[PDB]
Amino acid sequence: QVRPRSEISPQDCWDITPLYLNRKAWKADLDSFGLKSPTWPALQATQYQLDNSESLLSLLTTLFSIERKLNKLYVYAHLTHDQDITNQEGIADLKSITHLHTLFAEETSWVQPALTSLSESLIAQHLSAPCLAPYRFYLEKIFRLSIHTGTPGEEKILASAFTPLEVASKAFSSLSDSEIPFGQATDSEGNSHPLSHALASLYMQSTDRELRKTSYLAQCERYHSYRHTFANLLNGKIQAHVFYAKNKRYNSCLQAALYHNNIPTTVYTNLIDIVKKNSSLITKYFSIKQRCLNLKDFHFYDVYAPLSQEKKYTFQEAVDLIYTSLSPLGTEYIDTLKQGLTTQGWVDKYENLNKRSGAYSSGCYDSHPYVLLNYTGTLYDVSVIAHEGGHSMHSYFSRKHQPFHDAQYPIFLAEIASTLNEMLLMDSMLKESDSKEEKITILTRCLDTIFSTLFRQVLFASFEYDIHHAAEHGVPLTEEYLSSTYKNLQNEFYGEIITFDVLSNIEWARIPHFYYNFYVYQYATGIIAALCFLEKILNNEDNALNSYLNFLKSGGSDFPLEILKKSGLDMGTVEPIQKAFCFIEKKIQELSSLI
Ligand SMILES: [Zn+2]
Numbered sequence: 001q002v003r004p005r006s007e008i009s010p011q012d013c014w015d016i017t018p019l020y021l022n023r024k025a026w027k028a029d030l031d032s033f034g035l036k037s038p039t040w041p042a043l044q045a046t047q048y049q050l051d052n053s054e055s056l057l058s059l060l061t062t063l064f065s066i067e068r069k070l071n072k073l074y075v076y077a078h079l080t081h082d083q084d085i086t087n088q089e090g091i092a093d094l095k096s097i098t099h100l101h102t103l104f105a106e107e108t109s110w111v112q113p114a115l116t117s118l119s120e121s122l123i124a125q126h127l128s129a130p131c132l133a134p135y136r137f138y139l140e141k142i143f144r145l146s147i148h149t150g151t152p153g154e155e156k157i158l159a160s161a162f163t164p165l166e167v168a169s170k171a172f173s174s175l176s177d178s179e180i181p182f183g184q185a186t187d188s189e190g191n192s193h194p195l196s197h198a199l200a201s202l203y204m205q206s207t208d209r210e211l212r213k214t215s216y217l218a219q220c221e222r223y224h225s226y227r228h229t230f231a232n233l234l235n236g237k238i239q240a241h242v243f244y245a246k247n248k249r250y251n252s253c254l255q256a257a258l259y260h261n262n263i264p265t266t267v268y269t270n271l272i273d274i275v276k277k278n279s280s281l282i283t284k285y286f287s288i289k290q291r292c293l294n295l296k297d298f299h300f301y302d303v304y305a306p307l308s309q310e311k312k313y314t315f316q317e318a319v320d321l322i323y324t325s326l327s328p329l330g331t332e333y334i335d336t337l338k339q340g341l342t343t344q345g346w347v348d349k350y351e352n353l354n355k356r357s358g359a360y361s362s363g364c365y366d367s368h369p370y371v372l373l374n375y376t377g378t379l380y381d382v383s384v385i386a387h388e389g390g391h392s393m394h395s396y397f398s399r400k401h402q403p404f405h406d407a408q409y410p411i412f413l414a415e416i417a418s419t420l421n422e423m424l425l426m427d428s429m430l431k432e433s434d435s436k437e438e439k440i441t442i443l444t445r446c447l448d449t450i451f452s453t454l455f456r457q458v459l460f461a462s463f464e465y466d467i468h469h470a471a472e473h474g475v476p477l478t479e480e481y482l483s484s485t486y487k488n489l490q491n492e493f494y495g496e497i498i499t500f501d502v503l504s505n506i507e508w509a510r511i512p513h514f515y516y517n518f519y520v521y522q523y524a525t526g527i528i529a530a531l532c533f534l535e536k537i538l539n540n541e542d543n544a545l546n547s548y549l550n551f552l553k554s555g556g557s558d559f560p561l562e563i564l565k566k567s568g569l570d571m572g573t574v575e576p577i578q579k580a581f582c583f584i585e586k587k588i589q590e591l592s593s594l595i
Pocket residue numbers: 187193
């Protein structure tokens with residue numbers, strides 16, 4: 001039975017009063033700003049002398065202070081809104097603070113480019129100044145951009161091209177998501193099931209091979225018939241990256257994308273090489289799936305078929321499960337999380353009328369973490385708690401140990417804590433399990449995840465690498481070319497096990513253009529790091545646990561690889577990925593001898 005927000009008992013809800021007692025105070029605070037003409041005159045360019053470290057310190061100090069208050073107000077409004085998304089005051093509050101953030105962003109827009117255009121000498125003076133010492137990394141991140149930032153007129157133009165260069169991605173979406181017509185799948189009976197992106201995903205996991213097959217094949221036909229247009233559009237995007245890269249003084253698009261986070265191209269490059277050389281792991285896992293499904297061959301549409309075939313958990317029970325499942329993370333981690341889920345008011349637990357869908361973690365420097373759930377009682381639910389509990393603890397630990405400007409870990413590291421928790425939970429549940437059907441269920445979910453988030457992403461990564469390369473050398477990305485490149489790749493990865501269908505190599509066409517600009521590899525590095533940390537912890541290797549914990553408390557205080565190095569993961573070497581592969585190998589063998 002469905003209830004409105006106002007009838008939900010507050011023990012089921014998060015407690016956001018530590019931010020603001022009530023909306024009146026929130027509103028009161030929002031007011032202090034006096035919306036205007038400039039709203040912060042203190043932040044006008046003219047008020048600062050950037051050749052003077054004491055002035056700059058004053059600038060940073062003042063903008064971090066404002067920003068901090070804005071975020072507090074934002075989080076409060078956004079969390080309130082998500083309790084009931086149709087509430088009119090909810091909506092208006094949020095729109096205010098949001099407007100305020102945009103003002104802030106406009107008023108302070110002069111800062112970044114004024115800094116990136118200081119001389120080298122001034123740069124070094126600031127990176128050396130002790131009153132700026134707490135803000136070194138922060139400034140380091142900004143000054144690093146000087147060597148790839150031209151005259152202000154040159155930059156005015158690049159910023160200008162952004163608009164027209166959206167076209168490739170936009171056209172792609174209208175075709176892919178809206179206008180190209182979908183076809184029909186068929187089951188064994190002969191019922192046709194019409195298709196959509198969401199249905200296609202559902203049918204991938206079907207139990208009826210004929211549905212999986214006609215669904216996959218119809219998806220290929222959909223794209224194949226607009227193959228020249230998708231090639232044009234993708235060529236366009238890639239040429240966009242080439243345009244931006246070569247005019248900002250980068251030697252390739254990869255370097256352009258990896259610079260922000262200071263990643264050596266070799267890390268990207270070796271990830272691809274090492275992963276390809278472990279293609280055999282794909283071969284191993286999929287044959288188990290093939291033998292277990294009694295199939296004479298194994299098609300891409302077989303990859304997500306289930307091998308086996310339902311309990312229900314109260315919230316309480318979910319917690320008890322998490323609590324024992326994550327115990328290798330230590331008494332202290334386990335209790336803090338338990339306290340957050342049960343007495344500290346971190347969690348909004350259950351569905352109510354018009355509550356935001358799905359799940360997340362949020363909060364800001366000043367709050368504890370806030371987890372929005374739509375708890376329904378399934379095993380999937382439990383793992384969502386484990387996932388969100390991961391982000392939450394990460395954030396909690398970072399806020400407790402970092403100053404405001406260093407506390408937010410970058411995106412490159414944001415999936416590690418959550419993924420490690422998911423994996424740990426499954427690991428512990430296997431150990432604890434007696435049912436063999438369950439064990440297969442768990443092992444299967446776990447390897448499907450590992451294989452789709454690690455191997456499949458690295459495939460995308462080399463593809464994205466080869467096509468930017470080709471473009472850089474002026475080679476034009478025709479459908480013929482794209483489709484060969486992708487075919488060879490499918491081959492390097494899946495050649496020893498997968499039987500190809502005639503259109504299988506059209507996949508590159510269905511992958512959305514926002515999966516471009518080299519971020520997809522980060523899914524893989526994230527899972528590699530999570531699996532590495534986890535493997536060390538399950539084997540009590542040196543003090544791996546202290547290390548993971550130290551990682552969580554590091555926030556964004558340094559470049560992501562450096563943060564990881566400090567924590568015993570040297571992505572500059574082969575060790576972390578070997579530790580990941582160890583974990584996977586072990587799981588493939590457990591599964592292999594359950595058959
Ligand atoms: Zn059906």
